[PDB]
Design an enzyme around this catalytic site. Structure first.
Site, PDB file in Angstrom:
ATOM      1  N   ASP A 105       0.784  -1.227   0.000  1.00  0.00           N
ATOM      2  CA  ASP A 105       0.000   0.000   0.000  1.00  0.00           C
ATOM      3  C   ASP A 105       0.811   1.269   0.000  1.00  0.00           C
ATOM      4  O   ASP A 105       0.285   2.341   0.269  1.00  0.00           O
ATOM      5  CB  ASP A 105      -1.023  -0.002   1.145  1.00  0.00           C
ATOM      6  CG  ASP A 105      -0.406  -0.185   2.433  1.00  0.00           C
ATOM      7  OD1 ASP A 105       0.794   0.213   2.570  1.00  0.00           O
ATOM      8  OD2 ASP A 105      -1.145  -0.545   3.389  1.00  0.00           O
ATOM      9  N   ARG A 123       1.187   6.918   0.357  1.00  0.00           N
ATOM     10  CA  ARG A 123       0.422   5.844   1.053  1.00  0.00           C
ATOM     11  C   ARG A 123      -0.975   5.856   0.453  1.00  0.00           C
ATOM     12  O   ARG A 123      -1.623   6.888   0.360  1.00  0.00           O
ATOM     13  CB  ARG A 123       0.346   6.171   2.504  1.00  0.00           C
ATOM     14  CG  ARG A 123      -0.366   5.196   3.427  1.00  0.00           C
ATOM     15  CD  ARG A 123       0.099   3.762   3.306  1.00  0.00           C
ATOM     16  NE  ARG A 123      -0.382   2.938   4.391  1.00  0.00           N
ATOM     17  CZ  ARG A 123      -1.613   2.434   4.445  1.00  0.00           C
ATOM     18  NH1 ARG A 123      -2.467   2.595   3.436  1.00  0.00           N
ATOM     19  NH2 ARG A 123      -1.967   1.662   5.427  1.00  0.00           N
ATOM     20  N   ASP A 171      -5.434  -1.071   4.074  1.00  0.00           N
ATOM     21  CA  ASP A 171      -4.254  -1.557   4.838  1.00  0.00           C
ATOM     22  C   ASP A 171      -3.868  -2.932   4.347  1.00  0.00           C
ATOM     23  O   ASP A 171      -4.670  -3.878   4.439  1.00  0.00           O
ATOM     24  CB  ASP A 171      -4.624  -1.645   6.285  1.00  0.00           C
ATOM     25  CG  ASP A 171      -3.444  -1.896   7.182  1.00  0.00           C
ATOM     26  OD1 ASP A 171      -2.364  -1.457   6.812  1.00  0.00           O
ATOM     27  OD2 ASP A 171      -3.632  -2.550   8.235  1.00  0.00           O
ATOM     28  N   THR A 172      -2.707  -3.054   3.728  1.00  0.00           N
ATOM     29  CA  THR A 172      -2.199  -4.338   3.300  1.00  0.00           C
ATOM     30  C   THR A 172      -1.360  -4.941   4.425  1.00  0.00           C
ATOM     31  O   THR A 172      -0.887  -4.230   5.274  1.00  0.00           O
ATOM     32  CB  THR A 172      -1.317  -4.228   2.042  1.00  0.00           C
ATOM     33  OG1 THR A 172      -0.360  -3.162   2.229  1.00  0.00           O
ATOM     34  CG2 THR A 172      -2.173  -3.931   0.844  1.00  0.00           C
ATOM     35  N   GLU A 195       1.895  -6.426   6.231  1.00  0.00           N
ATOM     36  CA  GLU A 195       3.313  -6.202   6.069  1.00  0.00           C
ATOM     37  C   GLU A 195       3.975  -7.305   5.287  1.00  0.00           C
ATOM     38  O   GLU A 195       3.425  -8.416   5.145  1.00  0.00           O
ATOM     39  CB  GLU A 195       3.933  -5.942   7.428  1.00  0.00           C
ATOM     40  CG  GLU A 195       3.476  -4.564   7.898  1.00  0.00           C
ATOM     41  CD  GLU A 195       3.861  -4.224   9.305  1.00  0.00           C
ATOM     42  OE1 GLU A 195       3.622  -3.049   9.699  1.00  0.00           O
ATOM     43  OE2 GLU A 195       4.388  -5.113   9.997  1.00  0.00           O
ATOM     44  N   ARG A 238       4.181  11.246   3.892  1.00  0.00           N
ATOM     45  CA  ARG A 238       3.721  10.517   2.755  1.00  0.00           C
ATOM     46  C   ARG A 238       2.491  11.156   2.182  1.00  0.00           C
ATOM     47  O   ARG A 238       1.631  11.578   2.930  1.00  0.00           O
ATOM     48  CB  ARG A 238       3.384   9.076   3.151  1.00  0.00           C
ATOM     49  CG  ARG A 238       4.554   8.305   3.744  1.00  0.00           C
ATOM     50  CD  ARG A 238       4.225   6.861   4.075  1.00  0.00           C
ATOM     51  NE  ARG A 238       3.176   6.725   5.070  1.00  0.00           N
ATOM     52  CZ  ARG A 238       2.711   5.586   5.566  1.00  0.00           C
ATOM     53  NH1 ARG A 238       3.267   4.441   5.226  1.00  0.00           N
ATOM     54  NH2 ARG A 238       1.714   5.628   6.443  1.00  0.00           N
TER      55      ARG A 238
HETATM   56  C1  LIG Z   1      -3.907   5.493   5.148  1.00  0.00           C
HETATM   57  C2  LIG Z   1      -3.437   6.464   6.199  1.00  0.00           C
HETATM   58  C3  LIG Z   1      -2.481   6.088   7.156  1.00  0.00           C
HETATM   59  N1  LIG Z   1      -2.080   7.019   8.065  1.00  0.00           N
HETATM   60  C4  LIG Z   1      -1.094   6.702   9.130  1.00  0.00           C
HETATM   61  C5  LIG Z   1      -1.767   6.110  10.346  1.00  0.00           C
HETATM   62  C6  LIG Z   1      -0.765   5.095  10.870  1.00  0.00           C
HETATM   63  O1  LIG Z   1       0.084   5.903  11.664  1.00  0.00           O
HETATM   64  P1  LIG Z   1       0.403   5.320  13.053  1.00  0.00           P
HETATM   65  O2  LIG Z   1       0.662   3.953  12.948  1.00  0.00           O
HETATM   66  O3  LIG Z   1       1.456   6.250  13.654  1.00  0.00           O
HETATM   67  O4  LIG Z   1      -0.901   5.619  13.810  1.00  0.00           O
HETATM   68  C7  LIG Z   1       0.069   4.749   9.656  1.00  0.00           C
HETATM   69  C8  LIG Z   1      -0.099   3.378   9.052  1.00  0.00           C
HETATM   70  O5  LIG Z   1       0.798   3.199   7.923  1.00  0.00           O
HETATM   71  P2  LIG Z   1       1.261   1.793   7.366  1.00  0.00           P
HETATM   72  O6  LIG Z   1      -0.005   0.992   7.274  1.00  0.00           O
HETATM   73  O7  LIG Z   1       1.840   2.088   6.101  1.00  0.00           O
HETATM   74  O8  LIG Z   1       2.310   1.229   8.417  1.00  0.00           O
HETATM   75  O9  LIG Z   1      -0.271   5.704   8.637  1.00  0.00           O
HETATM   76  C9  LIG Z   1      -2.654   8.300   8.101  1.00  0.00           C
HETATM   77  O10 LIG Z   1      -2.283   9.136   8.993  1.00  0.00           O
HETATM   78  N2  LIG Z   1      -3.624   8.644   7.242  1.00  0.00           N
HETATM   79  C10 LIG Z   1      -4.069   7.757   6.336  1.00  0.00           C
HETATM   80  O11 LIG Z   1      -4.982   8.148   5.562  1.00  0.00           O
HETATM   81 CA   LIG Z   2       0.098  -1.675   5.874  1.00  0.00          CA
END
Ligand SMILES: Cc1cn([C@H]2C[C@H](OP(=O)(O)O)[C@@H](COP(=O)(O)O)O2)c(=O)[nH]c1=O
Ligand SMILES: [Ca+2]
EC number: 3.1.31.1
Length: 132
Positions: free
Chosen positions: A16, A30, A35-36, A38, A76
């Site tokens: 993702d 992102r 949510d994919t 890991e 991102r």
């Molecule tokens: C999709 C998305 C993720 N995020 C943040 C929340 C999560 O942060 P925290 O974990 O600090 O709370 C993280 C998840 O990313 P990944 O799923 O890439 O690891 O990305 C946003 O802030 N807004 C969004 O729209």
């Molecule tokens: Ca993910």
């Protein structure tokens, strides 16, 4: 109304997350509303592979920001990504390689579209949904 912009896919980071050449500079995006797993979790490789297949085979990549926040707390970009007109976010969910997730109201334009795809993927017991 939302609008699609040009970009070039530089690197699939994981299922993702993608690095794009956007406005002539590299930017990590992102994908909204998904949510994919890991890369080391079940279906992680497959989800990463789906993005890699896009990079390899898509002639046209487009970025569509939603109506709200454009960058997350990690720097991102937050967007819907399209490959030859097909929304990658929706395709991941439809194939059971991502769950609908991180649904914030400010960036929720395609929420019901994805929830529709999720429900089909779940009914079919695909991938993530094949697991009890
Ligand atoms: C999709 C998305 C993720 N995020 C943040 C929340 C999560 O942060 P925290 O974990 O600090 O709370 C993280 C998840 O990313 P990944 O799923 O890439 O690891 O990305 C946003 O802030 N807004 C969004 O729209
Ligand atoms: Ca993910």
């Amino acid at each position: 109304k939302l609008h699609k912009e040009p970009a070039t896919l530089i690197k699939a980071i994981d299922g993702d997350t993608v690095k794009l050449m956007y406005k002539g500079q590299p930017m990590t995006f992102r994908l909204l509303l998904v949510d994919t797993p890991e890369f080391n979790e079940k279906y992680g490789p497959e989800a990463s592979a789906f993005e890699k297949k896009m990079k390899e085979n898509a002639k046209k990549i487009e970025v569509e920001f939603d109506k709200g926040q454009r960058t997350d707390k990690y720097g991102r970009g937050l967007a819907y990504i399209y490959a030859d007109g097909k929304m990658v976010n929706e395709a991941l969910v439809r194939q059971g390689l991502a769950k609908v997730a991180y649904v914030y109201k400010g960036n929720n334009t395609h929420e019901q579209l994805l929830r529709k795809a999720e429900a089909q993927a779940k009914k079919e017991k695909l991938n993530i949904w094949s697991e009890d």
